[PDB]
Every structure is written in C-alpha cells, then in structure tokens.
Amino acid sequence: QFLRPKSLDEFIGQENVKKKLSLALEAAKMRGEVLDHVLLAGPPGLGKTTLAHIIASELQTNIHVTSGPVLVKQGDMAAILTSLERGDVLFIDEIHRLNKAVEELLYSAIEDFQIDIMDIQPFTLVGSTTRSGLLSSPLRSRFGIILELDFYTVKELKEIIKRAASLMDVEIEDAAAEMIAKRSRGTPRIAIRLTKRVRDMLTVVKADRINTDIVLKTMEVLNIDDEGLDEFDRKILKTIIEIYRGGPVGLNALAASLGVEADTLSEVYEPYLLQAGFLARTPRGRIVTEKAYKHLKYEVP
Numbered sequence: 001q002f003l004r005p006k007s008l009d010e011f012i013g014q015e016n017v018k019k020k021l022s023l024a025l026e027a028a029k030m031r032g033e034v035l036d037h038v039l040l041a042g043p044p045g046l047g048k049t050t051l052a053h054i055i056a057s058e059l060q061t062n063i064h065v066t067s068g069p070v071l072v073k074q075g076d077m078a079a080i081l082t083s084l085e086r087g088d089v090l091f092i093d094e095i096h097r098l099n100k101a102v103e104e105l106l107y108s109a110i111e112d113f114q115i116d117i118m119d120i121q122p123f124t125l126v127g128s129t130t131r132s133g134l135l136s137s138p139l140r141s142r143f144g145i146i147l148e149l150d151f152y153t154v155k156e157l158k159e160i161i162k163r164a165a166s167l168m169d170v171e172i173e174d175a176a177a178e179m180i181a182k183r184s185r186g187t188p189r190i191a192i193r194l195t196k197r198v199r200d201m202l203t204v205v206k207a208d209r210i211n212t213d214i215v216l217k218t219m220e221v222l223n224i225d226d227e228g229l230d231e232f233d234r235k236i237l238k239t240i241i242e243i244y245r246g247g248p249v250g251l252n253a254l255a256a257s258l259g260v261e262a263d264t265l266s267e268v269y270e271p272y273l274l275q276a277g278f279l280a281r282t283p284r285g286r287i288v289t290e291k292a293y294k295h296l297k298y299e300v301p
C-alpha cells in the first residue's frame with residue numbers, strides 16, 4: 001500500500017472534497033473533539049477508502065474497517081462498537097447494504113452512544129457508498145459531513161500516474177503519462193493498475209523509460225481502446241445496440257442479458273459510460289448515444 005496517499009497533502013485531486021474535509025478535520029483536532037460523522041459517496045476506485053484512513057491518521061485515532069454485507073447479526077455490529085475507543089473511526093464500506101438489524105443498532109449507537117442500555121465511547125462513523133441516495137433516510141441525516149467524489153480530470157490522473165511511476169522507480173515521459181490518463185476512465189485505481197501493466201511492458205522490452213510506443217503496446221495486450229473502454233464496457237454498449245436496438249432497455253433486462261448483477265452494472269460500469277457520453281438514462285431505460293455507435297464502428301440507425 002506504498003502507493004496510497006497517507007495524508008491530504010499527498011491526495012491529488014478532489015479539491016472541493018479536501019477543502020471541506022480539511023476544514024472540519026483541522027477544527028476538530030484543534031478542539032480535541034470527536035469529528036462529526038462523514039459520508040463518502042462516489043464510484044469505486046476514487047479514493048473513498050483512502051480518505052477514511054487519512055481521517056483516522058490525522059485525528060491520530062484507530063480505524064476499524066468493515067462492510068455492510070458482512071455485518072449480518074447484531075452481535076457482529078455490537079462487538080465492533082464496543083471495541084471502539086474514544087475518537088476512533090468506524091469505517092463501513094458499502095454502508096447502504098447494512099441489514100435492518102445492524103442498521104437499527106448502528107443508528108442507535110449514534111443517537112446517544114449506547115446500545116439498548118447494557119455504553120459506547122464517542123466515535124466518528126465514516127461510511128462509504130457509491131450512491132449516497134442508496135442510504136436509508138434515517139441514517140442519511142446522521143452524517144454532518146457529506147463528501148461527493150466525481151471522476152478525476154485527465155490532468156489530475158496524469159499527475160497520479162507520474163507519482164505512481166516514481167514510487168515504482170520507473171521513468172515515464174509526459175506524453176506517455178497523458179496517454180494512460182486518457183484511458184483510465186476517470187479513475188485513480190484504474191490509472192495505477194494500467195501504469196503497473198505498462199511497467200511490465202517496459203520490463204519485457206527492456207526500455208529505459210515509458211514512452212508512447214510502450215503504452216500503445218500495453219493497451220493492445222490489455223484490450224483497452226483509445227477511450228479507455230475495456231472488453232466489458234464494449235460488451236455493454238454492443239449488447240444494447242444489437243439486442244435492444246440502441247435502447248431504451250431496462251436495468252434488470254440489460255443485466256440479465258449480460259449475466260451480471262444489476263448493481264455491478266449501475267454502480268460500477270455505467271457511471272463512466274454516462275459521464276463520457278456513451279450512454280444515457282431515460283424513464284424507459286438506458287439508451288446508447290451516437291458517439292457510442294461511431295466509436296464502435298456501427299452504422300448510425
């Protein structure tokens with residue numbers, strides 16, 4: 001995890017998020033008070049986990065990691081709550097997936113810091129979700145700080161790439177870093193994994209630095225096109241084009257045809273497809289745009 005930022009000063013991008021978090025985080029440290037609960041929302045790979053760890057580290061408290069789909073019985077949640085020390089961070093990934101059982105108990109420990117009277121040390125709840133709207137109304141109004149992360153710019157991603165390459169002790173030319181950033185689908189996690197693969201090409205071809213040639217060879221091997229779309233991205237668009245005539249097609253129907261969970265489609269793949277203008281959502285369902293037809297070389301109906 002030597003590539004993960006350890007402080008906000010090492011976190012490139014998300015300027016609005018950082019200025020908001022920094023304000024409340026520094027104020028709380030200065031007062032020796034427990035930070036207000038924070039909600040981190042946005043597509044995966046954008047640094048929500050990273051920020052959660054940064055928060056605990058800045059407050060100099062312990063972070064307790066867990067996720068909604070794991071805490072089934074109240075006992076599971078109860079144990080974690082009691083292990084919390086004053087000022088500790090309770091980080092819950094996919095918090096919108098907490099079953100009513102543990103959700104009620106969590107909400108309870110937040111209203112007065114005491115579960116059914118049997119006592120909980122004041123703590124900071126930091127939840128993570130792809131869509132803040134997926135959270136229940138009750139728990140939603142519990143976070144005093146809501147941070148919405150959107151995709152990064154190509155410039156920010158390029159900077160993240162150069163930073164990663166330097167840490168892996170490998171030289172890379174600006175134009176090459178730009179090329180990778182343009183194909184990272186607005187996501188730091190994607191950009192870093194791509195940089196590692198390009199690093200492997202640099203190793204096999206025995207080059208002194210990553211250039212455009214090395215990047216293009218890597219992308220052909222990985223099957224990533226000039227827009228950064230991978231095999232499944234294209235499969236989604238092609239399926240809508242061929243099986244559904246460009247759409248509109250419902251989320252459930254599309255998911256069934258692709259053999260994947262609707263969630264993985266709407267929370268993981270569609271976000272960027274919508275942002276990049278390849279897909280659009282209508283009341284009747286998802287539809288492909290003219291840009292997708294042309295990018296994939298299909299005659300525009």
Ligand SMILES: Nc1ncnc2c1ncn2[C@@H]1O[C@H](COP(=O)(O)OP(=O)(O)O)[C@@H](O)[C@H]1O
Binds near residue numbers: 192
């Ligand atoms: N702003 C950033 N600068 C550098 N690396 C980042 C940034 N945001 C995310 N990453 C990197 O990407 C990977 C993914 O991040 P993570 O925090 O797990 O995403 P999320 O929880 O939103 O899915 C991490 O390896 C991390 O170190």
